[PDB]
Design a protein around this motif. Sequence first.
Motif, short mmCIF file in Angstrom:
data_model
loop_
_atom_site.label_atom_id
_atom_site.label_comp_id
_atom_site.label_asym_id
_atom_site.label_seq_id
_atom_site.Cartn_x
_atom_site.Cartn_y
_atom_site.Cartn_z
N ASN A 76 0.87 -1.17 0.00
CA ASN A 76 0.00 0.00 0.00
C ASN A 76 0.91 1.22 0.00
O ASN A 76 1.45 1.61 1.04
CB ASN A 76 -0.94 -0.03 1.20
N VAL A 77 1.11 1.80 -1.18
CA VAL A 77 2.01 2.93 -1.34
C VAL A 77 1.40 4.14 -0.64
O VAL A 77 0.33 4.62 -1.03
CB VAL A 77 2.26 3.24 -2.82
N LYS A 78 2.07 4.63 0.41
CA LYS A 78 1.57 5.82 1.09
C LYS A 78 2.03 7.09 0.39
O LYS A 78 1.24 8.04 0.23
CB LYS A 78 2.01 5.81 2.55
N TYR A 79 3.28 7.14 -0.05
CA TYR A 79 3.83 8.31 -0.69
C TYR A 79 4.72 7.87 -1.84
O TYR A 79 5.25 6.75 -1.83
CB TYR A 79 4.64 9.17 0.29
N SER A 80 4.91 8.75 -2.81
CA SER A 80 5.88 8.48 -3.86
C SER A 80 6.61 9.76 -4.24
O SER A 80 5.98 10.80 -4.45
CB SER A 80 5.22 7.89 -5.11
N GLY A 81 7.93 9.69 -4.33
CA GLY A 81 8.68 10.77 -4.91
C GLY A 81 8.43 10.85 -6.41
O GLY A 81 7.90 9.94 -7.03
N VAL A 82 8.83 11.98 -6.98
CA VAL A 82 8.71 12.24 -8.41
C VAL A 82 10.04 12.82 -8.88
O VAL A 82 10.63 13.65 -8.18
CB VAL A 82 7.56 13.22 -8.73
N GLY A 102 19.63 10.74 10.38
CA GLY A 102 19.52 12.18 10.36
C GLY A 102 20.65 12.91 9.68
O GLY A 102 20.69 14.15 9.72
N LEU A 103 21.58 12.20 9.04
CA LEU A 103 22.76 12.84 8.47
C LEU A 103 22.52 13.42 7.08
O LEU A 103 23.36 14.19 6.59
CB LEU A 103 23.91 11.83 8.43
N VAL A 104 21.41 13.09 6.44
CA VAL A 104 21.05 13.69 5.16
C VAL A 104 19.58 14.05 5.19
O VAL A 104 18.75 13.29 5.72
CB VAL A 104 21.37 12.77 3.97
N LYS A 105 19.25 15.21 4.64
CA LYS A 105 17.89 15.72 4.60
C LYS A 105 17.55 16.13 3.18
O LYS A 105 18.35 16.79 2.51
CB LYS A 105 17.73 16.91 5.56
N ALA A 106 16.36 15.74 2.72
CA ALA A 106 15.88 16.04 1.37
C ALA A 106 14.51 16.69 1.53
O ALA A 106 13.48 16.00 1.49
CB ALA A 106 15.80 14.79 0.50
N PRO A 107 14.45 18.01 1.72
CA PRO A 107 13.15 18.66 1.93
C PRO A 107 12.18 18.37 0.80
O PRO A 107 12.56 18.34 -0.37
CB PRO A 107 13.50 20.15 2.02
N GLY A 161 10.11 24.06 -18.71
CA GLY A 161 11.19 24.39 -17.81
C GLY A 161 10.67 24.43 -16.39
O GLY A 161 9.48 24.65 -16.14
N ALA A 162 11.56 24.19 -15.43
CA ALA A 162 11.06 24.12 -14.06
C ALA A 162 12.10 24.57 -13.06
O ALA A 162 13.23 24.06 -13.03
CB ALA A 162 10.61 22.70 -13.73
N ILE A 163 11.71 25.56 -12.26
CA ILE A 163 12.46 26.01 -11.10
C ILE A 163 11.59 25.69 -9.90
O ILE A 163 10.98 26.58 -9.30
CB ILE A 163 12.83 27.50 -11.20
N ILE A 164 11.48 24.40 -9.57
CA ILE A 164 10.56 23.95 -8.54
C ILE A 164 11.25 22.89 -7.69
O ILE A 164 12.18 22.21 -8.14
CB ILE A 164 9.26 23.37 -9.14
N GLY A 165 10.78 22.76 -6.46
CA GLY A 165 11.32 21.83 -5.49
C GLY A 165 11.06 20.37 -5.78
O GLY A 165 10.76 19.95 -6.90
N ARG A 166 11.21 19.58 -4.72
CA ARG A 166 11.10 18.13 -4.75
C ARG A 166 9.70 17.73 -4.30
O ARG A 166 9.34 17.92 -3.14
CB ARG A 166 12.16 17.52 -3.84
N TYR A 167 8.91 17.17 -5.22
CA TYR A 167 7.53 16.78 -4.92
C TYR A 167 7.40 15.33 -4.48
O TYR A 167 8.03 14.43 -5.04
CB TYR A 167 6.64 17.02 -6.14
N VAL A 168 6.54 15.12 -3.48
CA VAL A 168 6.15 13.79 -3.01
C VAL A 168 4.62 13.74 -3.02
O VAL A 168 3.97 14.55 -2.34
CB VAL A 168 6.70 13.50 -1.60
#
Lengths: 347, 347
Positions: free
Chosen positions: B36-42, B311-316, B335-342
Amino acid sequence: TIPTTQKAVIFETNGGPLEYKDIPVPKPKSNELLINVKYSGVCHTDLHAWKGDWPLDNKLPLVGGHEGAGVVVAYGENVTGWEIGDYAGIKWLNGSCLNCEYCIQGAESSCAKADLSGFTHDGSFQQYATADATQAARIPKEADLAEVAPILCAGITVYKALKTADLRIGQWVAISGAGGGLGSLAVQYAKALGLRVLGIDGGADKGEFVKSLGAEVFVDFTKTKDVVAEVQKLTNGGPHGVINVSVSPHAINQSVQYVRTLGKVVLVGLPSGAVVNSDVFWHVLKSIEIKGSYVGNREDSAEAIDLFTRGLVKAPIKIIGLSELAKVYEQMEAGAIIGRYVVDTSK
Amino acid sequence: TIPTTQKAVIFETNGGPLEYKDIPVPKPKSNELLINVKYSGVCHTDLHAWKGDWPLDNKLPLVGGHEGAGVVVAYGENVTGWEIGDYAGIKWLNGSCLNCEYCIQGAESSCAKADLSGFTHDGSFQQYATADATQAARIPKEADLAEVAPILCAGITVYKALKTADLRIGQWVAISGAGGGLGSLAVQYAKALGLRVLGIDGGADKGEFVKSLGAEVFVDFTKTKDVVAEVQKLTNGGPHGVINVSVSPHAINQSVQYVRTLGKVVLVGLPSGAVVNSDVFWHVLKSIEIKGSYVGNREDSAEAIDLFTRGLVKAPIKIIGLSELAKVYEQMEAGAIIGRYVVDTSK
Ligand SMILES: [Zn+2]
Ligand SMILES: [Zn+2]
Ligand SMILES: [Zn+2]
Ligand SMILES: [Zn+2]
């Protein structure tokens, strides 16, 4: 054409009677091959499985055996990559989970959920045995099933031990017990890896044999007073690696002394009550590594079997009947070392 | 309690409409987990899957996605080592054949029969997805599923790239494209590995960002006339390794020139038409190594995820709804100047 009943050598209690009788032909699980075992090797691992000597829990009742070579007669609905009639080998590691800390490093035999042929899972001392299709050994059709049966244990084991020694071509390896079955295989595999081989054993007969297999030098411990010093002199400082095929504590402890500076001492097999002793001062000063070498993984298996099929390793066998297998057990129990027996499951 | 129908974002042709609609819930095969996929990165890989940009054959129709974090709700009859409720990650490599030269040496991602999530096999942009149990990543219960989702792709990838660089603690690594999402993760992993980081990117905003992540030096290619000379000067001869996170052909070719003698130039990602050019005289004289770094294996995966969980790496991340996923595609297509979507699969 798969019968419903078959002959097998099975025991119902540890140390109990080894009964040659009729049992049902197993049906493979979804992931398993059903192999018509034509031949099976035998070694002391089977003795200890039957005796229950080891602190590992075995199945009861149990068909022993972990060196089976045979023909795939069926497989479960989820098996891929196999065809009816393919040659397959059933080995010590019958199956593992394939996704744990040990399986993902290629150490499947260390899997907490390892299924062990002839220990937790009915092995190769029957006419039809099941084995996980992913772990089973691929045997070329060019291979004699009887001749290859012992490679599935002794051959892969000594080959893996030599890889564990991590030696460069042209370096020296000492093989303790070089004239026995296991040691003789080790000499041949070491030659295939381009190593200079020093063999240690007892008697000029074993010495001539070891020399005929490509060993550059032989040290006869029945004639050489100081084996450590002799091995150090003959290799101009000590062998870069050592394979302790002999599980005599005396020989193992000598290997720690004669190995070269920066050398690798490899331990092989599962003896009872054997302890290696190493003086820490010299272990540190010489930066020695004492490494255990257990069973080969699927990569090791394919490499060792391939060297055998190319004719670069020879393991002469004495073929007997499965019905006679009990005698071998007795022998293994009552000491008295004997050559390499291969049981024919049709007899 | 497993439905038979679910929400998903699916397309029937490359470049076709990205439809958020109902589709059947898959049934796991004998080797598979049902998650049951709760979240997915893109990420842009999903763009290229949808467009069909890559000269690799993709499946049609297709649920995209290869960065899924979820909960095991079922599994096939041959799956062991997994329990209902375990957290699991669906990655680029969904499954492999397990019996080829690449699978048995631990290079499953090179399997000719590799199943690729969101490419040959329905991926993480649905509420319920199947994944071969041998390849699925185990996610600790202490990890936030949304936050860990991008580690399953970007994090493992840059960690593997740094391992490919094979550097000693304290050595210099140049990260080309250090201020983007991927590059920022690479900076953090490099610092966790005790490396000195020189970041290269464009713009003072990215420079401030890269410094805030612990990079010792930043080179702004919008304000540096001779990037090669500047990088060599700042590292007293060149970085011991370089990670080309940016797939800029010019930047890659610059990295070949500024890398230190005996240095490692690491290539990452799957660009179109990018060609690295290396003068053979200097390649030899400096004994440089230009190494491709593809996807991390299961060992790399476990290590990269562990560094995240500690906690040594963070990916907002920016959490949006699966129903909104089409917009992300559109942005990536433009083109895209946008963050990391989940994407949250429940919205
Ligand atoms: Zn054996
Ligand atoms: Zn395992
Ligand atoms: Zn991705
Ligand atoms: Zn494969």
